[PDB]
Amino acid sequence: SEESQAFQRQLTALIGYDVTDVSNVHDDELEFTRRGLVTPRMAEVASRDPKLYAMHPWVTSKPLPEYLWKKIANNCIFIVIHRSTTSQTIKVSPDDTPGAILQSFFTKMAKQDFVLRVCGRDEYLVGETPIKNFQWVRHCLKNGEEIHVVLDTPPDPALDEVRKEEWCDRKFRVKIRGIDIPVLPRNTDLTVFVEANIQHGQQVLCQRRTSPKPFTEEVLWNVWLEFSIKIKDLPKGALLNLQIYCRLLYYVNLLLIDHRFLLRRGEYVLHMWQISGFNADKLTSATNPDKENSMSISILLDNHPIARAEMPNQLRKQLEAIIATDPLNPLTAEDKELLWHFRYESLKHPKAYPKLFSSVKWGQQEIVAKTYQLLARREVWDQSALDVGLTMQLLDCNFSDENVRAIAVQKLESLEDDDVLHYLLQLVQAVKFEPYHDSALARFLLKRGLRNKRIGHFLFWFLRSEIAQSRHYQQRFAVILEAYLRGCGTAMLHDFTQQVQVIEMLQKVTLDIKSLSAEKYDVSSQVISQLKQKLENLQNSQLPESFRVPYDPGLKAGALAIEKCKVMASKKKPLWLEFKCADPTALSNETIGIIFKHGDDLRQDMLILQILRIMESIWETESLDLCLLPYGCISTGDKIGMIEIVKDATTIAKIQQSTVGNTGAFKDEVLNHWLKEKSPTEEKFQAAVERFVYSCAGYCVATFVLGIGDRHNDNIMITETGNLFHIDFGHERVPFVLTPDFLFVMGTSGKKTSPHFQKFQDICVKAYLALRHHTNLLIILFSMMLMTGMPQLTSKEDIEYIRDALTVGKNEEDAKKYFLDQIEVCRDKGWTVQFNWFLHLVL
Ligand SMILES: COc1cncc(N2CCc3nc(NC(C)=O)sc3C2)n1
C-alpha cells in the first residue's frame, strides 16, 4: 504494497521521470536492469560504516602542495573550538588526528564521545586521517582564514535507515517493410532512401541501403537486406543503426544482441529521432517517446545462442611511434595490422591499449576470441599505475566491448572519493557510450555514490540534469538514479526532497519574469515589484524552512533575504537571490547568493567548470596555484539551472562603465585604481596585484586550450581581492582576453616589460607545459565533452582544435615559443576585438 507505492511516487517525483513506465520500450532491458542493480545497491548499502557514512568526512591522500607548506612555518596549526559561546584556540600538529585532538582537549573544559563539526556547515572532522588531509583545512589555509569548530554529538545513523526491499552460419538480414510519418516537413516532391548499418564503436562493419522512393507520409519496401556479415560473426553491443536520407533526417538504433546474449528477432516498430542542424545522442538504443509526431520504421528479424618470438628494430620503432601518439591521431591500416600482429608486445605498454583495441576486426568472432585470450593475461595492465586519461579513453564512444570497457573500470575502482568527484561528471556522461543499460560503470557510479554522501549528492544532480533535459538517455539514467535513491537512505531522501521543491518553485518564478520585461534592456520598476511580491508569496507557507545548496552541499540555506533579491540587466532575465544561513552556529551575516537562469544550456557550463577543477589539480601536481574561481553551477532542467554568486566581485565591463561606461570607450589605468580603493593597506593592494597576475595567467592558459578565449569584458570578472575569472560559458579573432587594462597592473602599457609581467610570462608558460604533461587526459576530456555536452560537432575538426592548441608533437621549446607569440597578438590587437562586440550590434 500500500505504502510501497507512495515510495514509488516519491521516487518518480525526485527523478522527474517514471521508471515503472513501459509505454516506450520494445523489450525489457530497462526493467531487467532495475532488477539487476538491487544487489550492487544492497551490497553497498550492506557494507557501509553507518557513522562514517553519516559524517561523510571530506578528505584526501594527496600531499600538501609546496605553496601551502610555505603557508606554515611552525610545524603546528591553529584551531578555534567552541561549545556554547565559550571558545579557545589549540596549537595542533599538522599530522594530528581528530580523536587524538579530543585527548589534548578533554584536558581542558572540566577541571561519552563527541565530534568536531565545522561551524556553519554540515561538515565534520572525523576519522583516522591527519588534519592536514581534510579538504576544508587546505581550503582555509589557501584563503588565509581561521579554523572554527563546534563540539556537538554525531548524527544518529538511524536517520540513514533504508526502506526494506521487495524484489548460425547464415548471413545477417533484416526485412525493411517501410516508414511512416504522420505530417510531412517540406512538401515538394523529394526522393528518400533508408540506410542500415551494422555498428560497433562507430566502427561500421557492414552497410546496406534501399532503392529510394518518393517521400510520402507512408513508404513501403518489403525487402530483405542481406548483409556481408555472418550471424556467428556478430559481436555483443553491435547496433543495427537505421537512418533516413534525401540529407540525413532521422536515425534509430536497435541492439542486435540483447542483454541475455540473445540474437534479436521479430517485428519492431521504431520511432525515430530527428536530426537538427559526432554526438552521443546518435548512439542511443532509446526510441522516440513522441509517437504522434515522429517518423517511425517497421522491420523484421527471423535469424539463438553464444557467449613467442623476437621483433626487429625498425618495427619496434614504428610501434613505439604509434603508441606514443595522441588519442586523436588516427591509425592507418598499416598501423592497425602492426598493432595486431604484435599484440603480445603491444600488451606490455598500457598506453597502447586503446590503440590496440581499436585495431580489432570486431566483426570476426575468431579475432574477438583471440582478443579475449589477450585480455586474459592482464598482469601488465592490472599492475600499472592508474592513468585516468588512458582509462577514460577506453570508456568513450570508440569502444563498445563489454570486456574492454570493463578493464577500464577495474582501474577506476582504485580512485579515492576525492578523485571520483573530480571525474564524476565526465564518468556520468560516459554512460551515454555504454551499449547497455546495466554496465560495470553504471554499477561503479551507483556503488561509489551510495558509499559517500558527497559523491551521492553530486551523482543525484548530475543524473537529474540529464534526465530532465535529454530524451535520448533519460530512461537509462532514471533507472540508475532510482537505484541510487533506494539506498542513499531516508536522511538524504528528505534532503533531496527539500531541494527539489525549492528549485522547482524558483524556476517557476524565473520564467514568469522573462514574460514580463520583453527585452527592453531595462527592468521596469513594476518587474521588481512583482519579483518581490512573489517571493513573499512563496515563503508564506510553501517553501522549505531550509535546504542544502546543490552546488555546495555543506551549506544549508535558510530563509530568503527578500530585500536583496532581484532580476539582472540581461537580455535573458536571471534571478539574483540571496538566502539567510539556516545554520545558526555559522560565522557571518553573509547570505547565500544564487542566480537562477533560463536561456543558455548550462550543461555546457558544468562541463567547462569541471575541466577547470581538473586543470587546477594538475597544477597541484607541480606545486602550482593559479587561483581559478570555478564557482558552483548546476543544470537542473531545460536550458535552465542555478549558479553560485561570488561575493564581492564585478565585471571587467562595469569597471570600465564606472569612470566611463560609454557607448564603448576603454581606458588603461582604471583596473589598477579600482584595486587601490578596495585595499585598506598598500600590501593588500600588491597582494591583489598578486592574486590577479596568477588568476589572469591561469585563465589565459586554460581558456586558450579549450578555445573559449575570445570573450567579452562583460563575461570576465574580478574580486575586490584580485581574483579574476571568466563566467557565462553557455554564451580578426584573438587567442585570449589580455587587454591593455590588465597589463597596466603588470607595470606595462602595450610594448614594454616589468617586474610583475616577466613573472606573468613565467607562470603562463610553466602552467602551459604543465598541462602538456597531461596532454592525453585533456584531449580525451575535451573530445568527450564535445560529444556529450554540445550542439553538433565535426568528429574531425572541432574535436581536433585542442591538439594544435596543446602544440602536440612539439618540444617544450617550440611549444613555449608557440604560447609566447599567442601573447604577442593581444599586444598587437589591444582593444581591437574588445572594441568589436558592440559595433556588430548592426553587423
Ligand atoms: C548572466 O548569467 C550568468 C551565467 N553564468 C555565470 C554568471 N556569473 C557567475 C558568478 C557570479 N558572481 C557574481 N558575484 C557578484 C558579487 O556579482 S555575479 C556572477 C554571475 N552569470
Swiss-Prot record:
Modification Phosphothreonine, positions: 775
Give start and end of each PI3K/PI4K catalytic domain.
Answer: 561-831
Name its cellular compartments: Cytoplasm; Cell membrane
List UniProt keywords, sorted A-Z.
Angiogenesis, ATP-binding, Cell membrane, Chemotaxis, Cytoplasm, Disease variant, Endocytosis, Immunity, Inflammatory response, Kinase, Lipid metabolism, Membrane, Nucleotide-binding, Phosphoprotein, Serine/threonine-protein kinase, Transferase
- The enzyme's E.C. designation: 2.7.1.137, 2.7.1.153, 2.7.1.154, 2.7.11.1
Q: Where does ATP bind?
A: 593-602, 628-636, 725-731
**Can you say what this protein is called?**
Phosphatidylinositol 4,5-bisphosphate 3-kinase catalytic subunit gamma isoform
Give the species: Homo sapiens (Human)
Q: What is the gene name?
A: PIK3CG
